[PDB]
Design a protein around this motif. Structure first.
Motif, short mmCIF file in Angstrom:
data_model
loop_
_atom_site.label_atom_id
_atom_site.label_comp_id
_atom_site.label_asym_id
_atom_site.label_seq_id
_atom_site.Cartn_x
_atom_site.Cartn_y
_atom_site.Cartn_z
N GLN A 144 36.76 46.01 49.67
CA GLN A 144 35.60 45.42 49.99
C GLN A 144 34.66 45.22 48.91
OE1 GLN A 144 33.23 46.92 53.99
NE2 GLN A 144 33.58 48.39 52.55
N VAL A 145 34.80 45.80 47.85
CA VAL A 145 34.40 45.56 46.53
C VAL A 145 34.73 44.27 45.78
CG1 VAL A 145 33.89 46.29 44.26
CG2 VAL A 145 33.54 47.91 46.08
N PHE A 146 35.94 44.03 46.21
CA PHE A 146 36.56 42.75 45.49
C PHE A 146 36.20 41.58 46.25
CE2 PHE A 146 39.60 45.31 43.36
CZ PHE A 146 39.78 44.65 42.01
N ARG A 147 36.17 41.71 47.72
CA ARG A 147 35.59 40.40 48.47
C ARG A 147 33.98 40.55 48.32
NH1 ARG A 147 39.69 38.64 51.58
NH2 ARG A 147 38.70 39.37 53.33
N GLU A 148 33.47 41.52 48.16
CA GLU A 148 31.87 41.39 48.11
C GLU A 148 31.51 40.90 46.68
OE1 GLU A 148 29.74 41.58 50.07
OE2 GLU A 148 28.79 43.57 50.30
N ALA A 149 32.23 41.34 45.75
CA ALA A 149 31.95 40.72 44.47
C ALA A 149 32.29 39.22 44.51
CB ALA A 149 32.88 41.26 43.24
N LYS A 150 33.45 38.93 45.31
CA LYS A 150 34.07 37.42 45.36
C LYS A 150 32.75 36.76 46.08
CE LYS A 150 36.87 34.37 46.95
NZ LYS A 150 37.03 35.05 48.28
N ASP A 199 31.35 51.87 43.00
CA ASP A 199 30.28 51.73 42.18
C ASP A 199 30.92 51.19 40.78
OD1 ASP A 199 29.15 53.57 44.37
OD2 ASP A 199 27.44 52.67 43.42
N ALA A 200 31.77 51.82 40.23
CA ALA A 200 32.33 51.53 38.84
C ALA A 200 33.10 50.46 38.96
CB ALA A 200 33.16 52.85 38.41
N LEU A 201 34.22 50.53 39.88
CA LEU A 201 34.95 49.30 40.19
C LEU A 201 34.35 47.83 40.21
CD1 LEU A 201 37.42 47.53 40.97
CD2 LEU A 201 36.81 48.26 43.38
N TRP A 202 33.14 48.06 41.19
CA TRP A 202 32.22 46.89 41.14
C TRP A 202 31.66 46.62 39.91
CZ3 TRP A 202 30.69 43.68 45.07
CH2 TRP A 202 29.85 42.81 44.90
N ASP A 203 30.95 47.60 39.29
CA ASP A 203 30.40 47.56 38.16
C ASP A 203 31.14 46.69 37.12
OD1 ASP A 203 27.66 48.65 36.87
OD2 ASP A 203 28.04 49.64 38.57
N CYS A 204 32.30 46.98 37.27
CA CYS A 204 33.50 46.18 36.40
C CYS A 204 33.38 44.78 36.83
CB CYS A 204 34.89 46.79 36.59
SG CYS A 204 34.82 48.45 35.77
N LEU A 205 33.72 44.58 38.19
CA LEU A 205 33.82 42.93 38.78
C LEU A 205 32.55 42.29 38.23
CD1 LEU A 205 35.31 44.05 41.88
CD2 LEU A 205 36.48 43.71 39.80
N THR A 206 31.39 42.60 38.55
CA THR A 206 30.09 41.89 38.30
C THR A 206 29.84 41.98 36.92
OG1 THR A 206 28.96 44.09 39.11
CG2 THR A 206 29.20 42.37 40.61
N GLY A 207 30.56 42.60 36.09
CA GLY A 207 30.21 42.75 34.58
C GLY A 207 31.34 43.14 33.72
N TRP A 208 32.44 42.78 33.74
CA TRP A 208 33.50 43.35 32.76
C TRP A 208 34.94 42.48 33.15
CZ3 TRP A 208 33.93 46.85 28.90
CH2 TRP A 208 35.28 47.34 28.68
N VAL A 209 35.67 42.39 34.42
CA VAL A 209 36.61 41.76 34.60
C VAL A 209 36.55 40.31 34.19
CG1 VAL A 209 38.30 41.45 36.27
CG2 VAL A 209 37.05 43.47 36.14
N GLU A 210 37.66 39.68 33.84
CA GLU A 210 37.56 38.17 33.49
C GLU A 210 37.80 37.36 34.68
OE1 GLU A 210 40.57 36.05 32.84
OE2 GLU A 210 41.26 37.05 31.13
#
Length: 89
Positions: free
Chosen positions: A72-78, A35-46
């Motif tokens: 799974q969060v990296f591909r999902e965010a992808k 949930d956090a890692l994702w929270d970062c990809l969808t709104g934090w990481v460049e």
């Protein structure tokens, strides 16, 4: 930016979220969970971001379902539209 998951290095899920936090350069409160890692990809990481997951599976056995989830969060965010070139080694 580019990220690199060195499986031979990962010693536990926390380790996975550690190397990621470095790559993604997450804050100091990096939840470390999906949930956090994702929270970062969808709104934090460049992006476009690269996720050169090295020794994949090697970081999934130790912390069972440890890597398979973050990835799974990296591909999902992808999938969310982000440009995270998922590079599975």
């Amino acid at each position: 930016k580019k990220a690199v998951i060195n499986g031979e290095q990962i010693r536990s899920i926390s380790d996975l979220h550690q190397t990621l936090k470095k790559e993604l350069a997450l804050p100091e409160y990096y939840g470390e969970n999906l949930d956090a890692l994702w929270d970062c990809l969808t709104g934090w990481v460049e992006y476009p971001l690269v996720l050169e997951w090295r020794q994949f599976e090697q970081s999934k056995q130790l912390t069972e379902n440890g890597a398979e989830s973050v990835l799974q969060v990296f591909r999902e965010a992808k999938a969310e539209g982000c440009d995270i070139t998922i590079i599975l080694s």
